[PDB]
Symmetry: C2
Subunit: 175 residues, 2 copies
């Protein structure tokens, strides 16, 4: 497998990663300022997001940091260490997302107004802060600006289909 | 100059760092779950904080990530790369802190209730997200649980006094 050294090595990479509890998250560095993601397990299993604007930097050779804030009010700081197949993410959830996570379980792009209305109506504090390491179980070279990577809701067998080479074609597109 | 390799190498280190605009921040890894800080320039110059609880991990050899949330509602994710004298910090400010930063300019420990009252009374959104690199201009081995390191409000020449060896005694204490 390739060694990650530059920002360019990182961008266009499609990741699946697993937590200790077994929860599976999926994330794609679409370009130098945009991320797509899809959640397979845990509190917000079923949630997926495209075109989330983010700050993406290389901290040092092969280590990458992504910062963003969400329509729900959630703040995220993700650090990728792909050469060690490791990730560390900190999610700062507003109180209301901890209380009513199901509201955020949707294709967010079609419900932006609802997320914004919710974050003003319900409680913000205290925040649920979740700083956790994850193990990277899949890395794919999707290329940049590939709209097929995260283009539908998650389904039960999806991470397996992706890893087994049954989801994408030879060009990392959906047939 | 010593090489940082372990979490223990990092803990007990007292940092001063400068942004490109000239603003100076000061931060101390007091123990594996506690940080003190002091702000010398910028939006919240004059603010200082002790005993802030934080998540502190080593991402990989010599790279350290610190996550915390504040009585004001502010979320912080700091990444230290001390072997390269570099830091990257992302601060997610609630709207009200951007609007009224002077409210947060105090010794926070004596005004916790005021911070909590303010974060409920004023606007949270949109967040001011500030992801920026900084250059580390001072690293001192303070030891862990040193209550002298950040123990008074900042003053004009303080960073100079610290760097020039005029602030602390031989044991990293205040005379």
């Amino acid at each position: 497998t390739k060694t990650f050294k530059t920002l360019d090595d990182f961008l266009g990479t499609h990741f699946i990663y697993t937590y200790d509890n077994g929860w599976e998250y999926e994330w794609y560095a679409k370009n130098d300022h945009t991320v797509d993601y899809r959640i397979h397990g845990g509190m917000v299993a079923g949630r997926w997001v495209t075109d989330q604007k983010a700050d993406i930097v290389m901290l040092t050779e092969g280590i990458y940091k992504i910062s963003w804030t969400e329509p729900t009010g959630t703040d995220v700081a993700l650090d990728f260490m792909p050469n060690e197949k490791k990730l560390h993410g900190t999610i700062f959830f507003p109180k209301w997302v901890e209380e009513h996570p199901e509201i955020t379980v949707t294709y967010q792009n079609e419900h932006i107004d609802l997320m914004e209305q919710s974050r003003e109506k319900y409680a913000t504090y205290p925040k649920l802060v979740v700083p956790e390491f994850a193990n990277i179980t899949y890395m794919g070279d999707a290329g940049q600006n590939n709209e097929d990577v995260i283009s539908e809701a998650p389904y039960k067998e999806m991470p397996n289909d992706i890893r087994n080479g049954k989801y994408f074609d030879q060009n990392y597109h959906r047939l």
